[PDB]
Amino acid sequence: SGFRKMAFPSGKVEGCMVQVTCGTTTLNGLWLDDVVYCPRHVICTSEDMLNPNYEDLLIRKSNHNFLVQAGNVQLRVIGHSMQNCVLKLKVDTANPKTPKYKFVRIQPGQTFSVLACYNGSPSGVYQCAMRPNFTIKGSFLNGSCGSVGFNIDYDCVSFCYMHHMELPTGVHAGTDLEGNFYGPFVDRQTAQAAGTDTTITVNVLAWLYAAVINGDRWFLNRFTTTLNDFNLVAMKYNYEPLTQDHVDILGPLSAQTGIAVLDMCASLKELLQNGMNGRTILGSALLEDEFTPFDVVRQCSGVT
Amino acid sequence: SGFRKMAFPSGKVEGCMVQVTCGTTTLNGLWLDDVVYCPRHVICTSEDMLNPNYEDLLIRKSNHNFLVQAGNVQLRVIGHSMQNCVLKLKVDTANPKTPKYKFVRIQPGQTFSVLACYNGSPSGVYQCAMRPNFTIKGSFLNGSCGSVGFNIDYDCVSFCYMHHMELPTGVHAGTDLEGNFYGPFVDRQTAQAAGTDTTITVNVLAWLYAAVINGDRWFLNRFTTTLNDFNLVAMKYNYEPLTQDHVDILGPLSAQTGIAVLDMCASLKELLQNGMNGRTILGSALLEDEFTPFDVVRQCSGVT
Ligand SMILES: CO[C@@]1(C(=O)Nc2cncc3ccccc23)CCOc2ccc(Cl)cc21
Ligand SMILES: CO[C@@]1(C(=O)Nc2cncc3ccccc23)CCOc2ccc(Cl)cc21
């Protein structure tokens, strides 16, 4: 029992963290095999960020202009290329600590762990989610760029995020491991606004199922609702529309607790309309949406 | 910018996690040098837990009765001893992944990272704090016993907690790495009640300083207070008494923001008396007390 915003063990990802320097700029890189991945804005100065032509900036950069430092040893860059908003630096030595990996592009709503790094050194690890507006609410300072987001399936690291930008609103924007940004964000120092942040409904339902599993059952009511009725209420509260797929995914948690998914929706509906009334659920005074139904089952079963 | 309940990178602690079996019981152990530490209740059956004489139970256990499995290889137990509520199994092979370590007994209020394990395999990592009633609000299932709590100073792991027990209230009880329980808890299956959980005042103040640093400044008021006046209010709300030492420790965050510690106390006083009024601070609808002032500076400066 107990329910925490538990991140994946980061050891397998720490072994991939390197420091990438280009001129004055220094950020983090992810060394897997003989390739180091990092945000392509490593080639920019602060003046270049305002309006950068990365193709042009890159021309005035050679293999020796990139300094990759793993731990305290220097790596030899034997090739360089730009894949979307990431630089792929081919080094002459394969990472001896390269785990089994996949580069996956997650969907908004999915949650991953972030290993925040500075100078190729991991400083901490936390769990976060891809917001429906394709931002993350991370904890990143200057020099955290190149830090990755990941999931782990037994011994396989699925890299899904690379940190590039902090938006003026304090939210974070980044790319998948193929250099493509999540959302409309561009790696330019220009005013970019984050869209509406909606609440990932299926996740709040999953954390309500998690609460019932841990004894917090006060919010359980005598009512039920329909998918369409629940969604009219969800719409008003800027909550994601709940679909039959979401109900399907909640099936396991519905079976575990014996509470139908539409009964849980009615409890959520009353929580949305009536408020928490001073009470807490899993020590939280608000509805938590950064636990997928997969995170709840994993934490309440013990998947290692 | 951004503020998360960020745990330390767990890689250095994953390399110490082993599976310890004794008869039918299987829990986790911490292998540092040629010693594997684990909860002494590994020698008990479910009937023994009701009233165990560990000295007597241990007599009917020999070196070969303990099965330590690291990864997928078996370790040879060449000696065994009981230090308080922990078993110290001396193995013939020193852990090649043993980091620089210290065994430290933390004070209530201090926060550490937990690497939750099952069968010697790390399943996840989260940050938590030693409650003033010497319990932790962890996330532990059956088989998580032997999971450790730790802090990291650059390359040195300070082990401070070992998980032993879940109390009927869903809170967790454990020992330091010398086998001594935090609080009055005993490793017996007998009704043990957790005392009053108070709010770690100095930590809530630190997370208020962290909020101001991240732009959330709505709670800042035009008032100040005295230490004695603040404490009368803190007492009523079951908040820890604030001492001059706590004010001293908040000095750095006071200097960073230019907000005096007693001005921040007045903001906290109004937050306690008036409530959040529907608003959030750092995305939280309640006052967070599981960030020490050291955690705030570390997260807002980038200590790796
Ligand atoms: C190159 O770094 C930028 C940035 O936001 N990086 C950051 C990312 N995280 C946390 C940050 C905390 C403080 C300072 C910067 C942070 C600086 C502003 O202009 C831009 C413009 C585009 C891009 Cl792709 C990045 C950036
Ligand atoms: C030996 O394990 C016990 C326990 O609480 N362990 C646990 C610790 N964490 C999470 C748990 C989740 C579910 C089941 C047990 C959990 C079982 C009950 O009796 C006792 C009595 C004393 C002690 Cl020192 C431990 C224990």
The CA-based diameter of chain B, rounded to the nearest angstrom, is 69
Best probe residue, ligand 1, of A164, A169, A187 (max atoms within 8 Å of C-beta)? A164
Q: Which of B236, B172, B165 is nearest to B199 (CA)?
A: B236
Nearest-angstrom CA–CA distance, A220 and A257: 12
Asked if domains B15-99 and B198-301 share a fold, the reply is no
Question: Positive or negative CA dihedral for B47, B52, B55, B56?
Answer: negative
Are A171 and B7 in contact (CB < 8 Å)? no
Among residues A38, A85, A145, A160, the one annotated as catalytic is A145
Are A126 and B7 in contact (CB < 8 Å)? yes
**Pairing mode of beta strands A66-70, A73-75:** antiparallel
Q: Which residues of B touch A214 (CB under 8 A)?
A: 170
Nearest-angstrom CA–CA distance, A230 and A241: 9
End-to-end CA distance of chain A: 16
CB atoms within 10 A of CB A220: 17
CA A44 to mean position of chain CA atoms:
25
The chain A residue lying nearest B12, using CA atoms, is A11
Superfamily name with CATH number, domain A198-301: main proteinase (3clpro) structure, domain 3 (1.10.1840.10)
Which letter, b or e, does each residue of B114-132 get, where b requires 16 or more Cβ atoms within 10 Å of its Cβ?
bbbbbbbbbbbbbbbbbbb
Nearest-angstrom CA–CA distance, B296 and B300: 6
CA B297 to mean position of chain CA atoms:
19
Nearest-angstrom CA–CA distance, A179 and A192: 18
Among residues A16, A22, A41, A128, the one annotated as catalytic is A41
Nearest-angstrom CA–CA distance, B116 and B141: 9
Give the SS3 label for residue B166.
strand
Q: Which residues contact B173 (CB under 8 A, 6 or more apart)?
A: B134, B135, B136, B164, B165, B166, B167, B181, B182, B183, B185, B192
Are A7 and B126 in contact (CB < 8 Å)? yes
Helices A227-236 & A261-274, crossing angle to 10 degrees?
A: 30
Residues B267, B220 contacting (CB under 8 angstroms): yes
Q: Which of A96, A154, A169 is nearest to B214 (CA)?
A: A169
Q: Which residues of B touch A300 (CB under 8 A)?
A: 141
Q: Which residues of B touch A8 (CB under 8 A)?
A: 124-125
Nearest-angstrom CA–CA distance, A300 and A290: 16
Among the atoms of ligand 2, which is closest to the Cα of residue B190? 21
Are A10 and B11 in contact (CB < 8 Å)? yes
Nearest to A11 among B6, B11, B304 (CB): B11
CB atoms within 10 A of CB B79: 12
Q: Which residues of A touch B115 (CB under 8 A)?
A: 9
In what helix (H) or strand (E) does residue A222 lie, and over which residues does it extend?
A: none
DSSP label of A180: P
Are B9 and A11 in contact (CB < 8 Å)? yes
Tokens matching residue A24: 């004055």
Q: Which residues contact B29 (CB under 8 A, 6 or more apart)?
A: B17, B18, B19, B20, B36, B37, B38, B68, B89, B120, B146
Please tell me the distance between residue B25's alpha carbon and the centre of ligand 2 in angstroms.
12
Please tell me the distance between residue B192's alpha carbon and the centre of ligand 2 in angstroms.
12
Give the SS3 label for residue B226.
coil
Q: DSSP letters of A53-113?
A: -HHHHHHT--GGGEEEEETTEEE-EEEEEEETTEEEEEESS--TT--EEEE--PPTT-EEE
End-to-end CA distance of chain B: 16
A113 to each of A75, A98, A268, B27, B282, how far by Cα in Å?
A: 27, 18, 27, 26, 19
Q: Which residues of B touch A215 (CB under 8 A)?
A: 170
Please tell me the distance between residue B152's alpha carbon and the centre of ligand 1 in angstroms.
27
In what helix (H) or strand (E) does residue B102 lie, and over which residues does it extend?
A: strand B100-103
Tokens matching residue A274: 């009536």
In what helix (H) or strand (E) does residue A227 lie, and over which residues does it extend?
A: helix A227-236
Which letter, b or e, does each residue of B224-247 get, where b requires 16 or more Cβ atoms within 10 Å of its Cβ?
bbebeebbebbeeeebbebeeebb
Resolution in Å equals 2.3
Alpha helices in chain B (DSSP H): 11-14, 54-59, 201-213, 227-236, 244-249, 251-257, 261-274, 293-299
Nearest-angstrom CA–CA distance, A252 and A231: 22
Are A125 and B303 in contact (CB < 8 Å)? no
Is B188 near ligand 2, meaning CB less than 6 Å away? yes
Nearest-angstrom CA–CA distance, A101 and A98: 8
Residues B286, A284 contacting (CB under 8 angstroms): yes
Q: Which residues of A touch B280 (CB under 8 A)?
A: 286
Question: Positive or negative CA dihedral for A118, A102, A180, A32?
Answer: positive
Minimal C-alpha gap between B3 and chain A (Å): 5
The protein residue with its alpha carbon nearest to ligand 1, atom 16, reads: A142
The residues facing A186 across adjacent strands are: none
Which CATH fold would you assign to the domain B1-14+100-197? Thrombin, subunit H (2.40.10)
Nearest-angstrom CA–CA distance, A225 and B241: 47
Half-sphere exposure of B217 toward its Cβ, with a 13 Å CA cutoff?
A: 9
Are B140 and A300 in contact (CB < 8 Å)? no
Nearest to B121 among A166, A280, A304 (CB): A304
Is A199 near ligand 1, meaning CB less than 6 Å away? no
List, edge to edge, every strand of the sheet that includes B73-75.
B73-75, B66-70, B17-22, B25-32, B35-39, B86-91, B77-83
* Chain B interface, best mutation among A1, A16, A135, A274, by max B CB count within 10 A: A1
Nearest-angstrom CA–CA distance, B138 and B128: 7
Nearest-angstrom CA–CA distance, B266 and B274: 12
Q: DSSP letters of A231-261?
A: HHHHHHTTBPPP-HHHHHHTHHHHHHHT--H
Nearest-angstrom CA–CA distance, B70 and B79: 17
The residue whose two tokens read 């967790």 is: B172
**Pairing mode of beta strands A100-103, A86-91:** unpaired
Residues A115, A159 contacting (CB under 8 angstroms): no
Please tell me the distance between residue B19's alpha carbon and the centre of ligand 1 in angstroms.
43
Tokens matching residue B251: 């000095």
Nearest-angstrom CA–CA distance, A136 and A166: 10
Domain boundaries, chain B: 1-14+100-197, 15-99, 198-301
Is B84 near ligand 2, meaning CB less than 6 Å away? no
Minimal C-alpha gap between A7 and chain B (Å): 5
Rg of chain A's alpha carbons, rounded to an integer?
21
Q: CA triplet A157, A155, A201: central angle to 5 degrees?
A: 55
Tokens matching residue B64: 């070969």
Work out how many CB contacts closer than 8 A connect A with B. 142
Please tell me the distance between residue A39's alpha carbon and the centre of ligand 1 in angstroms.
11
The set of catalytic residues of B is: 41, 145
Nearest-angstrom CA–CA distance, B200 and B204: 7
Is B162 near ligand 2, meaning CB less than 6 Å away? no
Please tell me the distance between residue B105's alpha carbon and the centre of ligand 2 in angstroms.
22
Tokens matching residue B107: 């004070």
Q: Which residues contact A178 (CB under 8 A, 6 or more apart)?
A: A83, A84, A86, A103, A105
The protein residue with its alpha carbon nearest to ligand 1, atom 24, reads: A187
Nearest-angstrom CA–CA distance, A183 and A194: 9
**Pairing mode of beta strands B77-83, B73-75:** unpaired
Which letter, b or e, does each residue of B178-215 get, where b requires 16 or more Cβ atoms within 10 Å of its Cβ?
ebebbbebebbbeeeebeeebbbbbbbbbbbbbbbbbe
Task: Tell me the backbone φ, ψ of residue B99, rounded to 5 degrees.
Answer: -85, 180
The residue whose two tokens read 């009880």 is: B173
Nearest-angstrom CA–CA distance, B75 and B82: 19
DSSP label of B108: T
Tokens matching residue A268: 């959520």
Which CATH fold would you assign to the domain A15-99? Thrombin, subunit H (2.40.10)
Nearest-angstrom CA–CA distance, A296 and A206: 6
Helices A261-274 & A201-213, crossing angle to 10 degrees?
A: 100
